[PDB]
Design an enzyme around this catalytic site. Sequence first.
Site, PDB file in Angstrom:
ATOM      1  N   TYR A  65      19.065  29.971 -14.820  1.00 19.17           N
ATOM      2  CA  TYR A  65      17.733  29.567 -15.252  1.00 19.17           C
ATOM      3  C   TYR A  65      16.722  30.705 -15.195  1.00 19.17           C
ATOM      4  CZ  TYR A  65      19.452  24.765 -14.763  1.00 19.17           C
ATOM      5  OH  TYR A  65      20.160  23.587 -14.877  1.00 19.17           O
ATOM      6  N   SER A  92      12.873  31.795 -20.196  1.00 22.56           N
ATOM      7  CA  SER A  92      11.660  31.579 -19.402  1.00 22.56           C
ATOM      8  C   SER A  92      11.931  31.595 -17.901  1.00 22.56           C
ATOM      9  CB  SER A  92      11.021  30.245 -19.780  1.00 22.56           C
ATOM     10  OG  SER A  92      11.920  29.182 -19.471  1.00 22.56           O
ATOM     11  N   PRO A  94       9.831  29.891 -14.027  1.00 22.87           N
ATOM     12  CA  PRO A  94       8.797  28.898 -13.664  1.00 22.87           C
ATOM     13  C   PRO A  94       7.350  29.374 -13.821  1.00 22.87           C
ATOM     14  CG  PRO A  94      10.627  28.730 -12.144  1.00 22.87           C
ATOM     15  CD  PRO A  94      10.924  29.920 -13.032  1.00 22.87           C
ATOM     16  N   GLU A 134      13.237  21.331 -21.375  1.00 22.24           N
ATOM     17  CA  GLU A 134      12.439  20.095 -21.233  1.00 22.24           C
ATOM     18  C   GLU A 134      10.927  20.326 -21.335  1.00 22.24           C
ATOM     19  OE1 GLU A 134      13.612  18.660 -17.302  1.00 22.24           O
ATOM     20  OE2 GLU A 134      15.502  17.945 -18.120  1.00 22.24           O
ATOM     21  N   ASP A 175      16.239  13.446 -21.275  1.00 22.13           N
ATOM     22  CA  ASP A 175      16.875  12.251 -21.795  1.00 22.13           C
ATOM     23  C   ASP A 175      15.940  11.064 -21.794  1.00 22.13           C
ATOM     24  OD1 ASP A 175      18.958  10.672 -22.852  1.00 22.13           O
ATOM     25  OD2 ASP A 175      19.780  10.230 -20.964  1.00 22.13           O
ATOM     26  N   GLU A 233      23.138  19.954 -18.473  1.00 22.57           N
ATOM     27  CA  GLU A 233      23.329  19.489 -17.096  1.00 22.57           C
ATOM     28  C   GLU A 233      24.026  18.133 -17.118  1.00 22.57           C
ATOM     29  OE1 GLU A 233      19.500  19.128 -15.202  1.00 22.57           O
ATOM     30  OE2 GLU A 233      18.934  21.240 -15.485  1.00 22.57           O
TER      31      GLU A 233
HETATM   32  O1  LIG Z   1       8.264  24.911 -20.202  1.00 26.59           O
HETATM   33  C1  LIG Z   1       8.314  23.686 -19.442  1.00 26.59           C
HETATM   34  C2  LIG Z   1       7.870  23.920 -17.973  1.00 26.59           C
HETATM   35  O2  LIG Z   1       8.753  24.930 -17.429  1.00 26.59           O
HETATM   36  C3  LIG Z   1       8.511  25.114 -16.052  1.00 26.59           C
HETATM   37  O3  LIG Z   1       9.426  26.107 -15.696  1.00 26.59           O
HETATM   38  C4  LIG Z   1      10.810  25.837 -15.788  1.00 26.59           C
HETATM   39  C5  LIG Z   1      11.342  25.323 -14.456  1.00 26.59           C
HETATM   40  O4  LIG Z   1      10.720  24.058 -14.105  1.00 26.59           O
HETATM   41  C6  LIG Z   1      12.838  25.066 -14.635  1.00 26.59           C
HETATM   42  O5  LIG Z   1      13.331  24.593 -13.396  1.00 26.59           O
HETATM   43  C7  LIG Z   1      14.733  24.296 -13.260  1.00 26.59           C
HETATM   44  C8  LIG Z   1      14.892  22.883 -12.831  1.00 26.59           C
HETATM   45  O6  LIG Z   1      14.505  22.102 -13.966  1.00 26.59           O
HETATM   46  C9  LIG Z   1      16.349  22.594 -12.685  1.00 26.59           C
HETATM   47  N1  LIG Z   1      16.597  21.218 -12.248  1.00 26.59           N
HETATM   48  C10 LIG Z   1      17.689  20.437 -12.284  1.00 26.59           C
HETATM   49  C11 LIG Z   1      17.337  19.375 -11.579  1.00 26.59           C
HETATM   50  C12 LIG Z   1      18.173  18.124 -11.321  1.00 26.59           C
HETATM   51  O7  LIG Z   1      17.591  16.996 -11.940  1.00 26.59           O
HETATM   52  C13 LIG Z   1      18.300  15.805 -11.551  1.00 26.59           C
HETATM   53  C14 LIG Z   1      17.539  14.695 -11.912  1.00 26.59           C
HETATM   54  C15 LIG Z   1      16.498  14.305 -11.077  1.00 26.59           C
HETATM   55  C16 LIG Z   1      15.704  13.209 -11.395  1.00 26.59           C
HETATM   56  C17 LIG Z   1      15.947  12.502 -12.562  1.00 26.59           C
HETATM   57  C18 LIG Z   1      15.149  11.408 -12.873  1.00 26.59           C
HETATM   58  C19 LIG Z   1      15.386  10.694 -14.041  1.00 26.59           C
HETATM   59  C20 LIG Z   1      16.420  11.078 -14.888  1.00 26.59           C
HETATM   60  C21 LIG Z   1      17.220  12.173 -14.571  1.00 26.59           C
HETATM   61  C22 LIG Z   1      16.986  12.892 -13.406  1.00 26.59           C
HETATM   62  C23 LIG Z   1      17.785  13.989 -13.088  1.00 26.59           C
HETATM   63  N2  LIG Z   1      16.140  19.618 -11.068  1.00 26.59           N
HETATM   64  N3  LIG Z   1      15.772  20.717 -11.467  1.00 26.59           N
HETATM   65  O8  LIG Z   1      16.876  23.425 -11.673  1.00 26.59           O
HETATM   66  C24 LIG Z   1      16.720  24.835 -11.951  1.00 26.59           C
HETATM   67  C25 LIG Z   1      17.028  25.464 -10.588  1.00 26.59           C
HETATM   68  O9  LIG Z   1      18.303  25.059 -10.155  1.00 26.59           O
HETATM   69  C26 LIG Z   1      15.282  25.133 -12.113  1.00 26.59           C
HETATM   70  O10 LIG Z   1      15.177  26.530 -12.434  1.00 26.59           O
HETATM   71  O11 LIG Z   1      13.527  26.278 -15.024  1.00 26.59           O
HETATM   72  C27 LIG Z   1      13.028  26.744 -16.282  1.00 26.59           C
HETATM   73  C28 LIG Z   1      13.807  28.010 -16.687  1.00 26.59           C
HETATM   74  O12 LIG Z   1      13.593  29.007 -15.705  1.00 26.59           O
HETATM   75  C29 LIG Z   1      11.554  27.069 -16.193  1.00 26.59           C
HETATM   76  O13 LIG Z   1      11.136  27.377 -17.531  1.00 26.59           O
HETATM   77  C30 LIG Z   1       7.090  25.637 -15.819  1.00 26.59           C
HETATM   78  O14 LIG Z   1       6.941  25.953 -14.423  1.00 26.59           O
HETATM   79  C31 LIG Z   1       6.119  24.593 -16.304  1.00 26.59           C
HETATM   80  O15 LIG Z   1       4.842  25.202 -16.178  1.00 26.59           O
HETATM   81  C32 LIG Z   1       6.415  24.385 -17.780  1.00 26.59           C
HETATM   82  O16 LIG Z   1       5.556  23.333 -18.226  1.00 26.59           O
END
Ligand SMILES: OC[C@H]1O[C@@H](O[C@@H]2[C@@H](O)[C@H](O[C@@H]3[C@@H](O)[C@H](n4cc(COCc5ccc6ccccc6c5)nn4)O[C@H](CO)[C@H]3O)O[C@H](CO)[C@H]2O)[C@H](O)[C@@H](O)[C@@H]1O
EC number: 2.4.1.-
Length: 428
Positions: A65, A92, A94, A134, A175, A233
């Site tokens: 990521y 990108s 965060p 997303e 989703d 994922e």
């Molecule tokens: O562009 C959209 C947004 O992007 C944000 O940054 C981004 C950041 O949030 C994102 O983060 C991911 C993060 O989305 C990802 N991830 C996976 C999960 C697991 O989700 C399981 C889950 C949980 C709850 C649920 C509820 C309902 C349905 C399903 C579910 C699933 N959680 N996080 O894990 C990565 C680390 O392991 C983490 O890098 O990584 C990117 C790239 O690096 C940055 O671009 C910015 O910080 C925000 O400002 C911006 O608005």
Amino acid sequence: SFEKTPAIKIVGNKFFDSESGEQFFIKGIAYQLQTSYIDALADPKICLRDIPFLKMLGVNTLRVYAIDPTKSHDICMEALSAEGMYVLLDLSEPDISINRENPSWDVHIFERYKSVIDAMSSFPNLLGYFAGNEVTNDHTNTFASPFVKAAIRDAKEYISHSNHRKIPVGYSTNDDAMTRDNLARYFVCGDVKADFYGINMYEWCGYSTYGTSGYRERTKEFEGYPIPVFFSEFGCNLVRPRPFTEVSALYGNKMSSVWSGGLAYMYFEEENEYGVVKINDNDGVDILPDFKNLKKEFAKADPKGITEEEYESVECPHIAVGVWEANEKLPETPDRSKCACLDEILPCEIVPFGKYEEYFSYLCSKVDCSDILANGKTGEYGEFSDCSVEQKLSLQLSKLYCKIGANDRHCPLNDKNVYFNLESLQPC
Ligand SMILES: OC[C@H]1O[C@@H](O[C@@H]2[C@@H](O)[C@H](O[C@@H]3[C@@H](O)[C@H](n4cc(COCc5ccc6ccccc6c5)nn4)O[C@H](CO)[C@H]3O)O[C@H](CO)[C@H]2O)[C@H](O)[C@@H](O)[C@@H]1O
């Protein structure tokens, strides 16, 4: 040597090994430790520790990521290649991403994307880049998507004009039921298209089935989608240890004719219970109960594909208030030259080094800030809406300076970060 990983290419809606001509199916896992982020691929003692376990799992792809583009990645990328492993990589990070609450496609985010592309594109086992993750995620921020599409366009054009291999650029989505059809269609409509499409897919929890999980419905939903589609994922952790039985269905005959595979979320355990290993306090790898299940499932998976040889612009979704508000018109390619000239000639500048919204509210009530506004709903993008936040602020501060008209080098805002640009006087 990268012999064990020939470059993957895209033909129609499938991936193909560019040497063998066999369909490529992603059997992957997310690989990212929690600069704000940690770049495991830039630290050999980390990546070399984990590759043996990743090999045991039997994965052929990692999703990363965030990388640090100022660091070298050849050692880790070669070690991955030596075990047949590819990388999907977000451009990108965060702190530098298209902000879904206040979207922009500007020279600052573009420069980040360019740095990653220039750091990572020499590696044959770089499968593809994500131009966003997303960004739009429900019906309240669909207007974020035109900015992502512009980023897709400008990333592809940058790669095209570079000397690099033409690594595909795609998108990763969530989703949400109300937006997911419109999003899928949007990113392949009109003159700009994602090269591939990843869905973060958590519908299958515990010992579900093809029919009952919703997989059957998603599959028929995406049948005939004109670019490759996969789960960027998967791995609902409602029931533990995760059986990962969704894997049998995903690589089964019914699904493998549609989907190009998927990546489990994720390798590292981080107090969210999604890991298959936990790093102990002696920096060693402790294997968790999920691990054997993922391993045995990937091991049994045998997708049957078609070979490369044997193998009407889409209309964009119409606008409806509260439902879909992404204009088909996209913002322009961010212009670093135009914007860098603001740094040269403006009387009043602000250093980056927040209180931006205060300052914007203030200045945009005194002068017309139209020229830095960007509206993804209406498709109206101001002339300097592609510059950085600081440049945009500096532009408006300079307009107020000129409208007040003292010409006493006394920029109409107090802040340590505001300064008079002496370069402005030197006769873009
Ligand atoms: O562009 C959209 C947004 O992007 C944000 O940054 C981004 C950041 O949030 C994102 O983060 C991911 C993060 O989305 C990802 N991830 C996976 C999960 C697991 O989700 C399981 C889950 C949980 C709850 C649920 C509820 C309902 C349905 C399903 C579910 C699933 N959680 N996080 O894990 C990565 C680390 O392991 C983490 O890098 O990584 C990117 C790239 O690096 C940055 O671009 C910015 O910080 C925000 O400002 C911006 O608005």
